[PDB]
Design a protein around this ligand. Structure first.
Ligand SMILES: Cc1cc2nc3c(=O)[nH]c(=O)nc-3n(C[C@H](O)[C@H](O)[C@H](O)COP(=O)(O)O)c2cc1C
Ligand code: SF4
Ligand code: SF4
Ligand code: SF4
Ligand code: FES
Ligand code: FES
Lengths: 215, 429, 44, 264
């Protein structure tokens, strides 16, 4: 299906497609590789590939081949990684990739309402892009924001504990050139309860408190 | 001895859990972090393991393994190979955000724990494999690591100890199976997040083919506070074999969902009503609960009352604690639909290198969609049970157990719902 | 003493697309001599 | 005495070197444990989970292909738990396997058929729809039909460890894991036709020998190769006074199980 796991050459995605790293990306790559032992430099594949994705927005075959060439790895060892991990985009995506969580901790809290409100506001379907090439909607699994549900992820930022009105606001803002404030759209700032702090409303004790003697 | 419910802030171990104080080094020192770590280090490693043991601290990753013994499988002489410590921060288990909260609001505790456990095991660095969706959290973590390297708490002379230690962060590219000790390591090594078998054991041959000990964020973040205040203090909380202050995450069909620290072996009903605002409609409207994460069997209202939220009680309740992510359902739920979505999640997040999960999880997802519709016959429920049991103990990893268990719970407590769906489908024809 | 009525993690509203890697780069200055197997690679 | 250790197989005792696996011991007492992924010349991989046995006074089952043998372990090859593990793994393998046996050149010499008849059940409770995979095209010698792959990884481990190509892998994850290349690429080495021999399930087959015969017809003549001067040992399959194919033999000193494409 949409995730085919095969690659048939096209004019947009071929080995001759024009990818290359920037002189800054090369130094970041040098550092990354330095974060691993000297004999094991084929472990930088994931960070270098996500880096290329950041530079180019998505991942064409030439990108993987260049990553391999840089790290001196077989390109199939990179195709496998790219296909296995989902954060890696092998088709061009929109300016703002929207990943909606629809697992039960969020579903329970009316996530399909958000999925629909996005289906309508944007004029797309559950896995399509926009003609403007700005939005891209997909369904995904738990994003570690199960308590501030519902929630969605838009290009490395979370927007949590939201509602149709809030997502409508976010979309009206992204279509005006703004980047909203990541975080819950309700009163709470984080996983803290909504009613009020019920666990730690005291001040913290501070250094040397509770320390056992003989240490 | 009894009534392990309440816990004072004097004894809470993750003080900036709600982002109320500065998460940088100023708040860490002002709250009790990076204090006396020099003496902790100049103390022997065997002493740190003695503390981890006399504290009863059991891992929070999802399996109840005692650390001290785990971290003591690694206190051997070196064979000319660098020893490592890999922190597990890839919390993809539905309902779990505690590690996110830690990472982003009190990371210096995690760093100090890396250092302490490293001196305990003989490590040379700490690889913090963090989820890839947590970019801001990883950035805060790297900021903290830079602050620590500048202050001299990690690096060449970590706090002035003659012990040299590095801390590396590593992003994951979004996979739930990379949360296993072994697939974590493969990812770090560059290969797919395909787990490896045991034996070998990470302590013998692990990351980069070297000795390794994987550990959860919470475990390591707690280790220095234990070594500093005392394991006996940590062991006064909770029951005998299971002890400590455990983070909790209460999600779904609850009015005030939240994250909290409490005494283990706490009554679940209290844990909900006191900290959260109770289920939306009232305890009477509670259909069922998942005590731990999605990898834990359901339990219905009947036993949810007198149940203690720890390992052993939940085992005796035909379920498990896991990561302590209480998912609550009320009577307005197609529970079959929730469990089917869980099975679909496990279907997507399977790696695919061992036959049982690969095939049977998609099998069970199809069967579960059918049960949702009701197109099935009630003679297929036992077939599904047998399939689950064929998957359970025949896999390389636990994700097969995690995909098989919620089905067993559903069928062990909500069979009549399935049969009634089948009856309605037969009438509709 | 402090306020304890606000949120002190408001810096992640300013993270760029290249913050993590710039941080790792700046961090390399403090890193430690890495081990070495004795090879450039398994020679795959 | 020389670091050997005593171990049992259904009571029968045998002394095995350390590091020896359960499978090798059960062999040392004449028992052959089922297999779909262990090949005796390739890196170990515990994928098929068909090698599962129970150890006396042990709750779960171990992979005999990868678990080393410990002292005093008794290995129950023909107990209820082992049988049921095998039956489950067969159910799983055949769930998504296509009804292609009468068009599969591997018919009559398929390990899946024989292991289903000898170790698995005789029924299917799969009431769902199977999957399908678009076949590759890796050259004029090896025909790829990947609806029949049981993802054993033998082709990959062979290409990497023995041929030295490292162009085959696994694309994707989950039930949609597609063994093969990610791009169109001819896998034409000089040790390529052996991937045919080590693929148990006809996914990889000889295009020349395609459809030409069935194993029971052939009469097998033990001969040698002459294209080279190595003296590779081969079996010559014939069918009514006609050479149908060339198939290797075993000679641990020369051609353990391999032959060149020029030879076959
Ligand atoms: C599919 C799967 C996912 C897992 N995910 C996590 C996870 O997100 N976080 C975690 O700490 N442990 C996770 N574990 C458990 C691992 O074994 C973990 O690395 C280990 O238990 C951590 O050690 P500790 O529990 O002693 O702290 C997972 C296990 C499996 C099989
Ligand atoms: S159970 Fe699933 S995720 Fe775990 S090793 Fe097997 S195929 Fe991979
Ligand atoms: S193609 Fe054949 S040899 Fe390769 S993994 Fe599949 S079944 Fe095994
Ligand atoms: S591989 Fe074996 S079981 Fe599968 S179609 Fe061919 S002969 Fe039949
Ligand atoms: S279920 Fe949606 S963030 Fe966890
Ligand atoms: S023979 Fe052991 S898993 Fe395949």
């Amino acid at each position: 299906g949409g995730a085919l796991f095969v690659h048939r050459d096209t004019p947009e995605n071929n080995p001759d497609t024009p990818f290359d790293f920037t002189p800054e990306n090369y130094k970041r790559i040098e550092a990354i590789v330095k974060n691993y032992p000297e004999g094991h430099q084929a472990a930088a594949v994931l960070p270098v590939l996500d880096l290329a994705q950041r530079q180019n927005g998505w991942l064409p075959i030439s990108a993987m081949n260049k990553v391999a060439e840089v790290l001196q790895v077989p390109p199939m060892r990179v195709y496998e990684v790219a296909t296995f991990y989902t954060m890696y985009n092998r088709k061009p995506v929109g300016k703002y990739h929207i990943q909606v969580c629809t697992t039960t901790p969020c579903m329970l809290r009316d996530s399909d309402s958000i999925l629909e409100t996005l289906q309508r506001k944007l004029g797309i379907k559950v896995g399509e892009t926009t003609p403007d090439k700005l939005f891209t909607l997909i369904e995904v699994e738990c994003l570690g924001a199960c308590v501030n549900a519902p929630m969605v992820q838009i290009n490395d930022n979370y927007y949590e504990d939201l509602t149709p009105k809030d997502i409508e606001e976010i979309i009206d803002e992204l279509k005006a050139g703004k980047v909203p404030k990541p975080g819950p759209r309700s009163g709470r700032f984080c996983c803290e309860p909504a009613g009020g702090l019920t666990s730690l409303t005291e001040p913290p004790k501070g250094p040397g408190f509770g320390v056992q003697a003989g240490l | 001895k009894t009534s392990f419910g309440s816990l004072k802030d004097e004894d809470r171990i993750f003080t900036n859990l709600y982002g109320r104080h500065d998460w940088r080094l100023k708040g860490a020192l002002r709250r009790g972090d990076w204090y006396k770590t020099k003496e902790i280090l100049l103390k022997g490693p065997d002493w740190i393991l003695g503390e981890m043991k006399t504290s009863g601290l059991r891992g929070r990753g999802g399996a109840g393994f005692p650390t001290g013994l785990k971290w003591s499988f690694m206190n051997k002489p070196s064979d000319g190979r660098p020893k490592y410590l890999v922190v597990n921060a890839d919390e993809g288990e539905p309902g779990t955000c505690k590690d996110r909260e830690i990472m982003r609001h009190d990371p210096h505790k995690l760093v100090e724990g890396c250092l302490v456990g490293g001196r305990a095991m003989g490590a040379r660095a700490a690889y913090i494999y963090i989820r890839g969706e947590f970019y801001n959290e990883a950035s805060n973590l790297q900021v903290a690591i830079r602050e620590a390297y500048e202050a001299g708490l990690i690096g060449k002379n970590a706090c002035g100890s003659d012990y040299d230690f590095d801390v590396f962060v590593v992003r994951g590219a979004g996979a739930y199976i990379c949360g296993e000790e072994t697939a974590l390591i493969e990812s770090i090594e560059g290969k797919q997040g395909k787990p490896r078998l045991k034996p070998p054991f990470p302590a013998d041959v692990g990351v980069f083919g070297c000795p390794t000990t994987v550990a959860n964020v919470e475990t390591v973040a707690v280790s220095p506070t234990i070594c500093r205040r005392g394991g006996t203090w940590f062991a006064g909380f909770g029951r005998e074999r299971n002890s400590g202050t455990k983070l909790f995450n209460i999600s779904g069909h609850v009015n005030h969902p939240c994250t909290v620290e409490e005494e283990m072996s706490v009554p679940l009903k209290e844990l909900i009503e006191k900290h959260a605002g109770g289920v939306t409609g009232g305890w009477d409207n509670l259909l069922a609960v998942i005590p731990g994460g999605s990898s834990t069997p359901l339990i219905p209202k009947s036993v949810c009352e007198t149940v203690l939220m720890d390992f052993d009680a939940l085992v005796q309740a035909q379920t498990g604690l896991g990561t302590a992510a209480v998912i609550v359902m009320d009577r307005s739920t197609d529970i079959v639909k929730a469990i089917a979505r869980l099975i679909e999640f496990y279907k997507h997040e399977s790696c695919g290198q061992c036959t049982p999960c690969r095939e049977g999880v998609d099998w069970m997802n199809k069967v579960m969609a059918r049960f949702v519709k009701g197109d099935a016959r009630p003679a297929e429920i036992d077939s599904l049970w047998e399939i689950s049991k064929q998957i359970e103990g025949h896999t390389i990893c636990a994700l097969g157990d995690g995909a098989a268990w919620p089905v067993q719970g559903l069928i062990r407590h909500f069979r009549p719902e399935l049969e009634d769906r089948m009856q309605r489908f037969a009438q509709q024809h | 003493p402090t306020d304890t009525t606000t949120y002190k993690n408001l810096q992640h509203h300013d993270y760029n697309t290249y913050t993590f890697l710039d941080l790792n780069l700046d961090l390399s200055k403090f890193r430690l001599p890495q081990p070495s197997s004795g090879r450039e690679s398994p020679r795959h | 005495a020389s670091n050997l250790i005593e171990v049992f197989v259904d009571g029968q005792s045998v002394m095995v070197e350390p590091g020896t696996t359960v499978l090798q011991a059960c062999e040392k007492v004449g028992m052959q444990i089922p297999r779909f992924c262990y090949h005796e010349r390739l890196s170990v991989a515990g994928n098929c989970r068909m090698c599962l046995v129970e150890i006396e006074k042990a709750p779960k089952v171990v992979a005999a292909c990868a678990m080393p043998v410990m002292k005093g372990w008794n290995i129950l090859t023909n107990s209820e738990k082992s049988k049921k593990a095998r039956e489950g793994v067969m159910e799983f393998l055949l769930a998504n396997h296509p009804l292609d046996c009468p068009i599969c050149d591997q018919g009559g010499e398929c390990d899946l058929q024989d292991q289903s008849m000898m170790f698995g059940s005789d029924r299917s409770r799969f009431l769902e729809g199977k999957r399908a995979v678009e076949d590759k095209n890796i050259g004029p010698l090896v025909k790829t039909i990947m609806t029949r792959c049981i993802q054993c990884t033998r082709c990959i481990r062979f290409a990497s460890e023995i041929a030295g190509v490292d162009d085959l892998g696994t694309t994707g994850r989950g039930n949609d894991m597609q063994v093969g290349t990610y791009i169109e690429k001819m896998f034409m080495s000089e040790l390529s036709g052996n991937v045919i021999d080590i693929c148990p399930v006809g996914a990889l087959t000889s295009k020349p020998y395609a459809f030409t015969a069935r194993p029971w017809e052939t009469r097998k003549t033990e001969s040698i190769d002459v294209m080279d001067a190595v003296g590779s040992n081969i079996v010559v399959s014939t069918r009514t006074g006609e050479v149908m194919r060339i198939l290797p033999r075993m000679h641990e000193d020369i051609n353990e199980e391999w032959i060149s494409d020029k030879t076959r």
